Amino acid sequence: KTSGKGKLPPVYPVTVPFLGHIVQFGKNPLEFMQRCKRDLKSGVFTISIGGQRVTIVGDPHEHSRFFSPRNEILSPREVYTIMTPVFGEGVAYAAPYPRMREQLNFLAEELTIAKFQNFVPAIQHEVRKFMAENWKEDEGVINLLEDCGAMIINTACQCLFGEDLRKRLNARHFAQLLSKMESSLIPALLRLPLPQSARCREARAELQKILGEIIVAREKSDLLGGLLKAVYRDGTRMSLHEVCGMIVAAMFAGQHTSTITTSWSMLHLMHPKNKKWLDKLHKEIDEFPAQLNYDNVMDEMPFAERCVRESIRRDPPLLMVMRMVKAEVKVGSYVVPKGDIIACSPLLSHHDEEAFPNPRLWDPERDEKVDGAFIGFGAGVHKCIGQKFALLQVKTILATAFREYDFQLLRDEVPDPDYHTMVVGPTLNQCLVKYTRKKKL
Ligand code: HEM
Ligand SMILES: OC(Cn1cncn1)(Cn1cncn1)c1ccc(F)cc1F
């Protein structure tokens, strides 16, 4: 059972039992969680979605307690059921953890620092190719958020998709399918049974078929190829279904998190308030040639990476990460019982006054004042596997972009975090920016 002296973290009083806190938690979770933490004199607290127990680890010191326990204790599968139609049955979380671990490990091996051999030139190539087309005028106005999403997807494909695949699967067209597979991840039913999404099913099968054809044609380097060579610890290869899933996951995971990190970063540096930091950025990328190489970005862009880190810290794209509690776990002084859902919020954590004084301030030179406080890319057993690539990708984009362009916000102050989904980026209708082409002669 327990048992039986299991303590329980303070519960926040709900005005409406049936409602839960959803009405508030949606409008602005930050203020809400920040309020609970303050009033309950405890960084670790439990709130209820309607008729449900949810314990939030909002104490930076306690991140270990959340990220270190293995799936057997804290299981993510139950929470992320929703994504199964997207990743597929028996893929990722949907599958048993012994297999899941393997699947991800294979994807990881494909995004390792080892594979970045030509990635940089590939990225830099696609970026310029986009700027030339969509930013013709010497001085014009565009939407940064929409444009970063395009650069990200195009860039990623140039890296992880082979010549044959790209021509067959148009880069933009892939985002078309990717977007349809999400038309079902806009919740919006939690108490009732799960319904299938026609949009998602079709778009995935449309992608799976295409991929299927390439494999046949390929049968008389890229992520897809890398995945084919894959063999399990029992002597089994990944099926088309499983391969398609991993790729979809890789692209889904990257698209939204990176396009937001890239947007936020450009937005800060862009603001006159952050002129100083823009100067030290140019100190860094001015002496670089027009053609960047792996070394330039990986080992010669330290400040640039700091900007990206701080942008992820201040406004983490991933609101919370959650897991189903199967067994008792110790958290600080308190404890969380079986059956509950334990969450951990980068957003709340990154705003702890002790760990990040003045958390709404964008300071690329700030440091964890509590070791481990930053969980932008997760931690422990579930560390992000696309981190290294995301950074290479984002840093390279920042360079090419600020190498031959100057940007100016049309708004007064940096955009507001647009909280709706678990994924949070800058407010779309505020990401309008005027670009002016740098002087040449
Ligand atoms: C800046 C961009 C990115 C951010 C901010 C980010 C953030 C995160 C976070 C917070 C987690 C923790 C998930 C959890 O605790 O449940 C995570 C895990 C993960 N990420 Fe990312 N990520 C990024 C890019 C990517 C990319 C590009 C990929 C694939 C290409 C990727 C693949 C994964 C996978 C497979 C996991 C879970 C694996 C595990 O549980 O060990 N991520 N990421
Ligand atoms: O957990 C994510 C996506 N999901 C989790 N919370 C909200 N959506 C994070 N993802 C990883 N990097 C960026 N996003 C994930 C975990 C594993 C995975 F394979 C894909 C995937 F999106």
Domains of the chain, by residue range, sit at 1-441
Is CATH 1.10.3720.10 the classification given to domain 1-441? no
| Encoded amino acid at 211, one letter | L
- Which SS3 state, helix, strand or coil, does residue 430 take? helix
Partnered with residue 57 across adjacent β-strands are 44
**Is the CB of residue 247 less than 8 Å from the CB of residue 253?**
no
Tokens of 6: 């299991």
Q: Is the peptide bond before 4 cis (omega within 30 degrees of 0)?
A: yes
Q: How far apart are the C-alpha atoms of 382 and 397, rounded to whole Å? A: 27
Among 291, 32, 260, smallest CA distance to 149 is for 260
Tokens of 186: 């806009």
**If you take atom 10 of ligand 2, which residue's CA is the nearest one?**
253
Pocket test for ligand 2, best of 80, 246, 423 (most atoms within 8 A of CB): 80
From the number of C-beta atoms within 10 Å of its C-beta (0-12, 13-18, 19+), residue 163 rates as: exposed
For 29-65, the three-class secondary structure string (H helix, E strand, C coil) is HHHHHHHHHHHCCCCEEEECCCCCCEEEECCHHHHHH
Q: How far apart are the C-alpha atoms of 359 and 36, rounded to whole Å? A: 17
Query: What strands, in cross-sheet order, belong to the sheet with 139-143?
Result: 139-143, 432-437, 405-409
Question: Per DSSP, which regions of 292-415 are E strands?
Answer: 321-325, 329-331, 334-336, 341-344, 405-409
Tokens of 417: 């975090």
Spatial neighbors of 220 by CB under 8 A, at least 6 apart, are: none
Among 141, 159, 163, smallest CA distance to 151 is for 159
Q: How far apart are the C-alpha atoms of 418 and 438, rounded to whole Å? A: 31
Spatial neighbors of 409 by CB under 8 A, at least 6 apart, are: 267, 270, 271, 433, 434
Quote the DSSP letter at residue 15. S
Which residues have C-beta atoms less than 6 Å from ligand 1?
A: 76, 104, 111, 250, 253-254, 257-258, 261, 312, 317-318, 321, 376-378, 382-386, 389-390
**If you take atom 43 of ligand 1, which residue's CA is the nearest one?**
384
Quickly count: other Cβ atoms within 10 Å of residue 302's Cβ: 8
Helix (H) / strand (E) containing 437? strand 432-437
**Is the CB of residue 407 less than 8 Å from the CB of residue 275?**
no
Q: How far apart are the C-alpha atoms of 365 and 310, rounded to whole Å? A: 8
Q: Tell me, in angstroms, the distance from the centre of ligand 2 to residue 16's CA.
A: 31
Q: How far apart are the C-alpha atoms of 37 and 42, rounded to whole Å? A: 5
Cα dihedral value 330, 336, 340, 343, nearest 10: -60
Spatial neighbors of 43 by CB under 8 A, at least 6 apart, are: 37, 57, 58, 59, 60, 61, 62, 332, 352
| Residue 74 φ then ψ, to 5° | -110, 110
**Is the CB of residue 250 less than 8 Å from the CB of residue 226?**
no
Give the Å distances, CA to CA, from 368 to 179, 262, 349, 375, 400. Answer: 36, 22, 11, 11, 29
Q: Tell me, in angstroms, the distance from the centre of ligand 1 to residue 121's CA.
A: 24
Q: Ligand 2 in contact with 384 (CB < 6 A)?
A: yes
Strand 334-336 with 54-57, pairing: unpaired
- Which SS3 state, helix, strand or coil, does residue 286 take? coil
Helix (H) / strand (E) containing 310? helix 302-314
- Helix/strand/coil percentages in the chain, nearest 5: 50, 10, 40
Angle between helices 144-160 and 387-403 (to 10 degrees): 120
Q: Is the peptide bond before 355 cis (omega within 30 degrees of 0)?
A: no
**If you take atom 18 of ligand 1, which residue's CA is the nearest one?**
384
Q: How many CA atoms are closer than 13 Å to the CA of 258, on its beta-carbon side?
A: 30
**Is the CB of residue 201 less than 8 Å from the CB of residue 177?**
no
**Is the CB of residue 45 less than 8 Å from the CB of residue 37?**
yes
Among 78, 86, 14, 6, smallest CA distance to 325 is for 78
Q: How far apart are the C-alpha atoms of 119 and 297, rounded to whole Å? A: 11
Alpha helices in 163-239 (DSSP H): 163-168, 171-180, 198-218, 223-228
- Closest listed ligand to the CA of 75: 1
Q: Tell me, in angstroms, the distance from the centre of ligand 2 to residue 247's CA.
A: 13
Give the Å distances, CA to CA, from 173 to 86, 169, 236, 257. Answer: 17, 7, 32, 20
Q: Tell me, in angstroms, the distance from the centre of ligand 2 to residue 127's CA.
A: 25
Q: Ligand 2 in contact with 108 (CB < 6 A)?
A: no
**If you take atom 8 of ligand 1, which residue's CA is the nearest one?**
377
Q: Is the peptide bond before 3 cis (omega within 30 degrees of 0)?
A: yes
Q: Which residues are annotated as a binding site for heme?
A: 384
- Closest listed ligand to the CA of 76: 1
Q: How far apart are the C-alpha atoms of 182 and 75, rounded to whole Å? A: 23
**Is the CB of residue 401 less than 8 Å from the CB of residue 373?**
no
Residue with tokens 């067209």, as numbered in its chain: 173
Angle between helices 119-134 and 144-160 (to 10 degrees): 140
